[PDB]
């Protein structure tokens, strides 16, 4: 039972870092507009 | 379950390589 | 001048890509063959496709690097 | 050249990397039809410019040594 | 600059010339920048696997 | 410094995702190992550098300026 959790929360664990180097990402590209 | 073991453990070895 | 002209033709050549040009085998058998001898439910289908779908992109990707390092 | 609460939302993130990366894809091939365009580009302005260079040296000095020879 | 003022300045050797005093003061600043910049771009590419 | 035929196409998708991964993990591993040697290299040779900076500058000027006093 217990290793599926794991890997769900593995998965979870992925997902949150992605979303949030999208954030970080959108934040510089209105960085670069500015400049621009 | 053969297979979803390797798929648990590189699912693992990503999380892992990510945090690091 | 003329080691200039030599830099910005081994420029040109390790920075082709297979999107801008074709690797020939004619090339590669006369630089890579005898001349460095020479020389030196609804929810289940959703990973169904979505995982397949990003290891394809992954592939793609790796194999469109490895074009480019036999070009450097 | 050429030519429960928690198996729902990991369903959610897959999917969503999926999008993003289909979106990546289309953004990525509308850079690369731009970089062909200003390859093109380039190598009309290669040809060009080295007619210009022989045409242009060949018509300062010409009249003169044909003159004189 | 250095060059442009170099047929223009009085050659001789009692004293030296406020020109040249303020030139040498902007060289020895610029040399300044240079090697603060070069320490800046050091401590900027630091890692982990390379320094604690 | 420090001193279903679906299912499984996916499961062989994630696993090589992750085999991937591990090789390009000993890549960088080894280009780490080049970059500390050339950072060690270079850290010899500012010693070095410096040094010879001052002993060429010394060893030129001292010995007319020792005997003008
Ligand atoms: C479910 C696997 C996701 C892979 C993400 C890769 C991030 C570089």
Not at chain 5, 33 to 44: A, F, K, M, R
Request: proline content about 3%.
């Amino acid at each position: 039972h217990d290793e599926i959790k794991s890997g769900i929360d593995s998965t979870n664990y992925i997902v949150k870092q992605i979303k949030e180097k999208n954030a970080y990402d959108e934040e510089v590209g209105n960085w670069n507009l500015v400049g621009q | 379950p053969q297979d979803l073991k390797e798929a648990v453990e590189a699912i693992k070895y990503i999380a892992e390589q990510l945090e690091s | 001048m003329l080691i200039v002209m030599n830099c910005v033709i081994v420029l040109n050549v390790s920075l082709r890509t297979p999107n801008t040009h074709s690797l020939s085998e004619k090339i590669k058998h006369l630089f890579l063959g005898f001349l460095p001898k020479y020389l030196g439910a609804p929810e289940i289908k959703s990973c169904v496709e979505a995982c397949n779908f990003i290891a394809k992109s992954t592939k793609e990707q790796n194999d469109s690097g490895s074009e480019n390092e036999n070009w450097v | 050249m050429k030519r429960n609460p928690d198996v729902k939302s990991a369903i959610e993130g897959v999917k969503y990397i999926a999008e993003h990366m289909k979106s990546d894809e289309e953004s990525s091939n509308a850079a690369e039809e731009w970089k062909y365009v200003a390859m093109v580009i380039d190598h009309i302005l290669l040809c060009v410019f080295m007619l210009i260079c022989i045409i242009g040296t060949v018509s300062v000095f010409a009249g003169r040594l044909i003159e004189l020879s | 600059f250095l060059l442009l003022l170099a047929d223009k300045v009085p050659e001789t050797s009692l004293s030296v010339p406020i020109i040249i005093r303020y030139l040498m003061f902007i060289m020895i600043l610029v040399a300044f920048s240079v090697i603060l910049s070069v320490v800046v771009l050091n401590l900027h590419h630091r890692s982990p696997n390379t320094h604690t």
